[PDB]
């Protein structure tokens, strides 16, 4: 979990922005 | 509509990676 | 990786399922 | 355009995820 959490969280902030857009 | 559609998919998207992560950190 | 196999493998079909809509 | 734009950003998606996969499988 430690090792994946940057790369987990980076995923979860892309996704957010891209949400973001549609608005 | 298709970009209703796009945007109920994308909320689904993020709140299957939210709980991904709830059961690697939980644990 | 083997208990995260199948979780990743369907998200990486959501994805390319989500792409193909754009066509 | 945006859904030029769009589609683009979820080709790169798509290939963040191959990366990820990749790392984790190897090893």
Redesign the interface.
């Given at each position: 979990?430690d090792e994946x959490y940057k790369?987990x969280e980076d995923x979860?902030e892309?996704x957010?922005k891209x949400?973001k857009?549609x608005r």
């Amino acid at each position: 979990a430690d090792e994946x959490y940057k790369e987990x969280e980076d995923x979860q902030e892309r996704x957010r922005k891209x949400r973001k857009k549609x608005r």
